[PDB]
Amino acid sequence: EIVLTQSPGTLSLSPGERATLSCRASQSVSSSYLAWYQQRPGQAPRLLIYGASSRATGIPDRFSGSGSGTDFTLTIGRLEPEDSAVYYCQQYGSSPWTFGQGTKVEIKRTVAAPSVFIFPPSDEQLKSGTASVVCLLNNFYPREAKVQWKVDNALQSGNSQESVTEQDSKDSTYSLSSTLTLSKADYEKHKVYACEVTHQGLSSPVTKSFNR
Amino acid sequence: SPLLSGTPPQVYNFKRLVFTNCNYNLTKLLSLFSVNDFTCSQISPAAIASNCYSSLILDYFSYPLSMKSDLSVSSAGPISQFNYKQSFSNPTCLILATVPHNLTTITKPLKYSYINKCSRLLSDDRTEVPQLVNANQYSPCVSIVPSTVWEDGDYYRKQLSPLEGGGWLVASGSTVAMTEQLQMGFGITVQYGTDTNSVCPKLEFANDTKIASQLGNCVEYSLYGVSGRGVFQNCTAVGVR
Amino acid sequence: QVQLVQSGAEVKKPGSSVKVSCKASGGTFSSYGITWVRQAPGQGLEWMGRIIPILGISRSVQKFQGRITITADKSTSTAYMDLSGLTSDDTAVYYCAREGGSGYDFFDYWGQGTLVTVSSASTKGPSVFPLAPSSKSTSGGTAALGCLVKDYFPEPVTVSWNSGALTSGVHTFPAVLQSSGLYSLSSVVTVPSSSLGTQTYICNVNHKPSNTKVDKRVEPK
Structure with a gap:
């Protein structure tokens, strides 16, 4: 011992x-x-x-x-x-x-201005359960990235849950997946959904747009 | 005399003392220990005290009383099979003794360890052949196993140089807890002779067979191979001494 | 150079028994121990025990003594532990590793590892969720699409694309606890094959406890 x-x-x-x-x-x-x-x-x-x-x-x-x-x-x-x-x-x-x-x-190599994408819910678990939206933030350095969900141009509470993968062996970059699971019925007048990203990368908060 | 110093070696590394010409008083040794188990085969335990042989071989080591059962021709364990095997051909006594407090310079090894397993893993696929120690043979696994085994169960392996024979002379060692007094084991392997015997008990003649206290009496005499009958007397020395 | 292939995530109940089986691919247990090594989730390795099939000898750490039996079948050359009498605190990933002897007991080659998950809650099936690629994205470089895995309880679920072919941009995210004991993880891949796409009939998922495999096709919407 x-x-x-x-x-x-x-x-x-x-x-x-x-x-x-x-x-x-x-x-x-x-x-x-x-x-x-x-x-x-x-x-x-x-x-x-x-x-x-x-x-x-x-x-x-x-x-x-x-x-x-x-x-x-x-x-x-x-x-x-x-x-x-x-x-x-x-x-x-x-x-x-x-x-x-x-x-x-x-x-400690790069600061990697991130790439933000939304994958909004589709009619397979909008036909059972609780749907969930998601925000992918692919290729970013370092781990200092914060995403807040924006619903119908109104800010959201702490009902998110962000998961960040470890740096790639060659890429040495950190990708994210902030998720916003919701009550399966609550997709009426909330026309737009978005994730707001604050990073060393890219001057502004890079917000997004769903509509559809 | 060399038996009464240092750290006596563990069972698989037993030292040897061969006496081919001397006079022995064994009880003058066993008095110095507290004998615990005197078991002898092919000669009686009392008979090993007074009779003449051709060579007396003594092996000594540290062996606790907790496992006196393993050390005999009866056992099939690891003490009599991979550690120390004494010849069944010739007579053999085995003492399991104990050191007393009042004895000094018998230092204490930290623990009693023994070779649990000794095998050879063939240079072919996975065939295994145990190594059984013949008459005293030092247990060929003795190279890898250090003088004392460190932990409860250890694992020592070496690779024989290719041809011969590519087989890992694998060995293992296991220890037993220390006892307050060093508990030793001795093995005597006497063998007789054709017609010559050169190790006998030292039997001293008493004052009855003494030149003094007999001056003036007609006595038989035998002095250094010259025998006769006469009367001795005290006188001034003559001749060359 | 012997690769070590283990078993798969036993889900047991607090008060059970798990035989983790480490296989000695080659047919050859030579003069080589198997030492087992715990690692509680998000923690640092321990020692659990060692055996040598060549001699049958076994040794165990003091804490895990009276609960663990580490055996091996030299003939078929496969080693196993059997952690009987285990509590909920032993939910950890267990590795098997190759000894070297007495003064050289460093752990050379390791096993893939077998996560034991021990709590009487449930086993739930990997309900795979919509992919739905975003339309107007990059100008060809990265058209991102991913088939999500939500609502399952016991980990692992490995999700490769192209049944293990597309291995160049499969980003997998560690599962995170939801409101229930179930957790969810997300798989995404990048294609330059923008319109149509060559291979889009993909997304194999394997669940070690449930043994349910789901494959789905991606469609640009």
Whole structure:
């Protein structure tokens, strides 16, 4: 049993910048008995470093491994956008083998003026249940995007629910899907529905239009 | 004397002492321990104390009393099959003793560990062949297993260099809790000789067979292979000593 | 280099039993353990146990001891856990991973993972929802269309387009809890094939608990 600290956590760094990840151990561990792992957005963790010095067979030697006794540091000499992942330092030194809290690397490249689209309800769940409208915000950086629903030119309450996907391995961009489920009957005089987006991207709030 | 120092080794790494010419007083050793289980096969437990052999072999290690059942020709467990097997051909005594407080410089290993399993996984598909230790053989899995096993159940494997034989000489180790007093196990494997015996109990002659306290009496004498009958007396030395 | 293929999201009830089956594609359990590794949803990995089919030996962490049995069938070469006596707090994704021995117990190759979901609420079917592509959109680059999956309870539902062909702009959003314990996720794809479209008979969805598969065609409205 060894509780262990990690790096600050979320890190914003431009591509081509060195990244340092720390792994202090509350209890002393062997100078070379710790292994740094990397898990991609939605997948199984892949071994990056074993023994705190050696590299896993087929791992590009940007991911240098060092540190001994108490503090172990993983240093990524160059950064590409295919490094955005969660890194865990596991001390297979003691027992039971304690995984690290984990650090998240976010590669800081672009601000991606977003693309806003509406997908207004159609006559398949307007023939059962509760319909739902949706607002897609495809290709945008970073995660600082807020969408508020506008109904018949009147602002809406907190009955939304926004879901944002993780950055793509090559694209390194963040797409969104704010949803407004409604009572299946309530589509009478509310002629127009829209989502208002505020972003680093694009001067204005980019509102939209349904009519139909 | 070398038995009474250091950290005695675990069961699979038992050290050996072969005595091929000396005089032994075993009770002068067993007095120094608190004997707990004296079990002997092919010679009586009292008979191992006084009779002459050709070579006396003694093996010593740390073995708790919690599992005295595993250590004999009866068991089929891992102690008598992957750790330490003593020859059934020749006589054999087995002592399971205990260290006392008043004894010093018998230091304590942290725990008693033993090789639970020792197999070989063939260079072919998945065929497995257990490794059974023959007469004392040090249990060929002994290379991977360290002197003491660390945790409750461990897993040590190595790859033999290809040909020979591509088979992972896989081994496992298991430990047992420490006991307040170091509990040891000893194994004596005596074997007789053709017509020569060179290890015998040290039998000392008493003052009845002494030159002194007999001056003036006609006695039989046998001095360093010269025998006769006469009367001894005290006188000033002559000749060369 | 052995790929590890596991089983699929058991939904059990608080007080049940789950046999997660990790398969050793190759036919070959060599001198190689399987170590199991929890990960509570939105949390950080733990250790749960290890076995070696070559020797049958098993070991378990102290907390999970008396509730877990990790076995393997060396002959057919397939390893399983059986977390009997489990509570609602064990709802987590469980991985299986390859040992290396004594001083080299780092987890080399991993399994895809098998989300166990343990609470006596329900199992509900992926009611697929209208797509309805927007008319006046981009000038050809990205005509966005997506077939939505709402109203289902137990995750997972994988939704590939073109039954796993169109893999170049399939954006999938993580399911978010609705008013009921059910949650919903949305799938979208971008086509340059504006009018008509080549392949538009798409949107395969697989639900591991319900085992219901729905395929629908997209129409520009």
